[PDB]
Design a protein around this nucleic acid. Structure first.
Ligand SMILES: [Mg+2]
Ligand SMILES: [Mg+2]
Ligand SMILES: [Mg+2]
Ligand SMILES: [Mg+2]
Ligand SMILES: [Mg+2]
Ligand SMILES: [Mg+2]
Ligand SMILES: [Mg+2]
Ligand SMILES: [Mg+2]
Ligand SMILES: [Mg+2]
Ligand SMILES: [Mg+2]
Ligand SMILES: [Mg+2]
Ligand SMILES: [Mg+2]
Ligand SMILES: [Mg+2]
Ligand SMILES: [Mg+2]
Ligand SMILES: [Mg+2]
Ligand SMILES: [Mg+2]
Ligand SMILES: [Mg+2]
Ligand SMILES: [Mg+2]
Ligand SMILES: [Mg+2]
Ligand SMILES: [Mg+2]
Ligand SMILES: [Mg+2]
Ligand SMILES: [Mg+2]
Ligand SMILES: [Mg+2]
Ligand SMILES: [Mg+2]
Ligand SMILES: [Mg+2]
Ligand SMILES: [Mg+2]
Ligand SMILES: [Mg+2]
Ligand SMILES: [Mg+2]
Ligand SMILES: [Mg+2]
Ligand SMILES: [Mg+2]
Ligand SMILES: [Mg+2]
Ligand SMILES: [Mg+2]
Lengths: 58, 171, 206, 142, 98
RNA sequence: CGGAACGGAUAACCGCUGAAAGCAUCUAAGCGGGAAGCCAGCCCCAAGAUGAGUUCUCCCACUGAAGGUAAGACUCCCGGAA
RNA sequence: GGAGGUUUGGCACCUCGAUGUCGGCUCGUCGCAUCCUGGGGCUGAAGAAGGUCCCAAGGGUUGGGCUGUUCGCCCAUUAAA
RNA sequence: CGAGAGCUAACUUCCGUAGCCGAGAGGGAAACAACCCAGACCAUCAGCUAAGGUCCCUAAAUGAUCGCUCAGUGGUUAAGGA
């Protein structure tokens, strides 16, 4: 799961550590990594979460 | 440290990323230099300034300055080293451009100049080397001298033209 | 570089001046120039030429066509000489002059499966002072436990024979021109009548 | 439960090597081969891109390494010892140097052998694989 | 598309008939209305405390015992072998929420 | 008949240009010289170098994975310094 | 002050439901703290023959009398034993 | 850790003491009873952490900032020298 998540993370120019820190920095994201994987199989929603996360480490 | 310079009248100095071109009476005497230093010149006179006083930084300044000094003064006036052979026999001669030593060995010992270096044998026991790249004239004179470096007892061999030498004793 | 093929015929006695010498007679018969291999069309420079004609009835069709590109009669052996670029066909006379050194390459005589005393000049072991490896046997074969190995490369009973062997600096004693014979000082390897090749010295020593 | 896909992809890329450190470039190629850049869809299958290095002979070794680095490789024979080719004279056949790096980091298993296939070193500025139409990819990572 | 996050229930944009761990509401009565943290309804993705706005109902379908498993354990040279039975209870449900 | 020569990069070593210290110093940038040793060079193996390479030539496109077949091998016979 | 583990040991760890032991013979291969050979420095090195240290493991390193011997002594040679 | 015996040797021998191993699984230390983390009731394709880690193998910052060492030191000692 983790190995698949950082792939899309870096695909957008973030990475696993920064991306889950940004999905944690917003309190409201509490989904399991497996569901982040299924999102990594649906690029549009994954990018929506990437922009959400990255708007939380600013 | 050393810095003051004297560029003459019949030469010209380019500059490019530290590595300048030079011409004059004998051109194409380019030399490498480091980018970290300031290859520069006012006009009537040159300089190499050191940007920072670091130890390894400081060494390059004096290295590069003597190098530009020799490289430009050699195209401006030239270099010429003289030597003498000493010992019984020890002939030398010029075949075309090549120098035939005939010096204390079963065979004649020849040397073919690298380009830019000119041998001359003004006297049968007097070698002379003329050129610009002082580094190459030095390696050429050394290649001749090594053929019979002086012995510790009697001083047979190649010698710089004014040279003295120590003599061990023996029987 | 330059070379030709032929067949070892036999050995003999010979007198150059008064010094008796053993020569070996190769027959280096004419060789067709079959294939002119150039690096621009083959990656490397060489020439392939033939020896000992084969009755056309015995050729495959592909080989009749191989030769048929070159206008050449089928020959049971073809070979390639690196760096060699002759013209016409390779007669032996033109390639050699009397006294010049030539390497002589032929296939060693197959002695089959040979012991170690025969193959590698092994020692043997006493033939009476106790044993029952009376001769022949290689003795020990390794250390003990440390490297449990027996070395890769180790010398052992085996096929002593049939190797290609080159023999260096043989001397052309004589050249019979219209017979396509060529004398060579001393021995060359092979059973008689095997193929062999004569070439310029691999190392032209001074 | 977890999504897996078919190996339907086959992708070609031209990594450059000129001026790059060895090793730095080598890990990038090992990552692209082993598949980490795409959602590493399985351990089980090799979904990595095909990687066509060019100008490998302009590779940089950033230390004193061009000398004094060594290349031991054992021929089974005793005295076939550390048959040390070591240096820039291994840049007599430059391409294998780079291979040896990425294969140093590609897996040692059946699959790990089999992926080395897709490594296509080319010490010159030119490569044959125009029919594959490889896609450019930059030596800087981020 | 989307799945239960096992820890109890709670999931995303599905529509199906999936098993999960037991519910302590028996029958098909539950009509469970679970909260969901993500949704792709209309291909319009929504997540976060936006997904505390939306909620999805799903009837309970059936209580059940899963496929059997043994629990076997071993340790060398100590005699000691162990063996035990196990099946995990669950409550399969079918989905039809917003 | 052979070990070898020529080549290249090298060990101890010997130097060229040369600073950091307006000297000196083979080195700190740089460069040249130097062994029976390292690489190449000699002879032999080798594309199961599954990374399976090249070249020349031949048979062609048959009938319903199979079958008669081409080019072409083999079986068997007679032998061989194999 | 270190190094190496080749000596006599210490210790008692695997092996007493078996790890054959000293010398020779036969095959070898490796280290280098280098006997010869190659390249050097210094020498109280004139030359020659040396001394001693450095780099160097490609190859090479003899045959006999005494004793089971290893070893050692001796014969007679060696580039060297 | 503290002593004796030993050579301030020993994966040596004998006591005191704490912990582990014996009787101990799981992560780390490439590998490894003893070390460092942590005591396995069962099931899960859930989450935070310990030691230990985040270039590729190999999970996770080719992280950030001031330096330090150009020795592959890192990745095997000392008296002594520079
Ligand atoms: Mg005998
Ligand atoms: Mg035995
Ligand atoms: Mg061992
Ligand atoms: Mg073994
Ligand atoms: Mg036990
Ligand atoms: Mg030579
Ligand atoms: Mg040097
Ligand atoms: Mg040289
Ligand atoms: Mg020799
Ligand atoms: Mg068929
Ligand atoms: Mg037993
Ligand atoms: Mg037994
Ligand atoms: Mg030594
Ligand atoms: Mg000597
Ligand atoms: Mg003398
Ligand atoms: Mg030896
Ligand atoms: Mg004591
Ligand atoms: Mg004990
Ligand atoms: Mg005890
Ligand atoms: Mg017990
Ligand atoms: Mg316990
Ligand atoms: Mg444990
Ligand atoms: Mg360890
Ligand atoms: Mg482990
Ligand atoms: Mg144990
Ligand atoms: Mg245990
Ligand atoms: Mg232990
Ligand atoms: Mg700890
Ligand atoms: Mg965690
Ligand atoms: Mg921590
Ligand atoms: Mg990783
Ligand atoms: Mg100290």
């Amino acid at each position: 799961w983790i190995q698949r998540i950082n792939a899309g993370a870096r695909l957008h120019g973030m990475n696993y550590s920064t991306f889950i820190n940004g999905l944690k920095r917003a309190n409201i994201d509490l989904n399991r990594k497996v569901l982040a994987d299924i999102a990594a199989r649906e690029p549009e929603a994954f990018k929506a979460l990437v922009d959400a996360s990255r708007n939380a480490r600013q | 440290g050393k810095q003051p310079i004297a560029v003459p009248s019949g030469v010209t100095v380019n500059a490019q990323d530290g590595v300048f071109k030079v011409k004059g009476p004998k051109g194409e005497l380019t030399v490498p230099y480091n980018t970290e230093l300031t290859v520069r010149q006012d006009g009537d006179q040159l300089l190499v300034e050191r940007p920072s006083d670091a130890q390894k930084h400081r060494a390059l300044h004096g290295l590069t300055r003597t190098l530009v000094a020799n490289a430009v003064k050699g195209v401006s006036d030239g270099y010429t080293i003289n030597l003498e052979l000493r010992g019984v026999g020890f002939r030398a001669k010029l075949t075309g451009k090549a120098l035939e030593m005939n010096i204390g060995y079963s065979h004649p010992v020849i040397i073919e100049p690298p380009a830019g270096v000119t041998f001359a044998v003004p006297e049968p026991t007097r070698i002379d080397v003329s050129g610009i790249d002082k580094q190459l004239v030095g390696q050429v004179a050394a290649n001749v001298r090594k053929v019979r470096k002086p012995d510790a007892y009697h001083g047979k061999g190649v010698r710089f033209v004014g040279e003295q030498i120590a003599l061990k004793a023996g029987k | 570089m330059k070379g030709i093929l032929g067949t070892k015929i036999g050995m003999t006695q010979i007198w150059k001046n008064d010094r008796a010498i053993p020569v070996t007679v190769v027959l280096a018969g004419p060789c067709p120039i079959v294939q002119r291999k150039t690096a621009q069309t083959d990656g490397y420079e060489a020439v392939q030429i033939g020896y000992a004609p084969k009755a056309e009835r015995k050729v495959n069709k592909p080989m009749q066509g191989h030769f048929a590109k070159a206008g050449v009669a089928p020959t049971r052996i073809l070979r390639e000489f690196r760096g060699f670029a002759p013209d016409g066909d390779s007669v032996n006379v033109d390639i050699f002059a009397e006294g010049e050194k030539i390497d002589a390459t032929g296939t060693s005589k197959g002695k089959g499966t040979q012991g170690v005393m025969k193959r590698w000049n092994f020692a043997g072991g006493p033939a009476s002072h106790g044993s029952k490896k009376w001769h022949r046997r290689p003795g020990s074969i390794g250390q003990r436990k440390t490297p449990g190995r027996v070395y890769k490369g180790k010398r052992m009973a085996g096929h002593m024979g049939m190797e290609r062997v080159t023999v260096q600096n043989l001397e052309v004693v004589e050249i019979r021109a219209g017979e396509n014979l060529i004398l060579v000082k001393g021995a060359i390897p092979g059973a008689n009548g095997g193929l062999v090749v004569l070439r310029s010295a691999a190392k032209a020593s001074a | 439960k977890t999504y897996i896909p078919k190996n339907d992809e086959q992708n070609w890329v031209v990594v450059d090597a000129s001026g790059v450190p060895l090793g730095r470039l080598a890990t990038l190629i090992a990552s692209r081969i082993r598949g980490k850049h795409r959602p590493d869809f399985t351990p089980n299958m090799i979904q990595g891109d095909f990687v066509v290095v060019i100008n490998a002979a302009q590779v940089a070794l950033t230390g004193k390494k061009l000398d004094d680095k060594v290349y031991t490789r054992y021929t089974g024979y005793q005295g076939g010892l550390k048959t040390e080719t070591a240096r820039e004279a291994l840049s007599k056949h430059p391409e294998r140097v780079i291979e040896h790096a990425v294969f140093g980091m590609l897996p040692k298993g059946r699959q790990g052998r089999a992926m080395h296939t897709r490594l296509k070193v080319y010490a010159g500025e030119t490569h044959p694989h125009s029919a594959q139409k490889p896609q450019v990819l930059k030596t800087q990572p981020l | 598309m989307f799945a239960i996050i096992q820890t109890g229930g709670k999931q995303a944009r599905v529509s199906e008939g999936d098993v999960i761990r037991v519910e302590s509401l028996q029958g098909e009565a539950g009509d469970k209305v679970e909260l969901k943290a993500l949704f792709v309804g209309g291909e319009q993705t929504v997540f976060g405390e936006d997904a505390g706005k939306y909620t999805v109902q799903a009837e309970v379908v059936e209580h059940g015992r899963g496929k059997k498993i043994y629990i076997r354990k071993y340790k060398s040279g100590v005699q000691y072998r162990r063996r035990t039975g196990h099946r995990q209870n669950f409550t399969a449900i079918k989905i039809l929420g917003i």
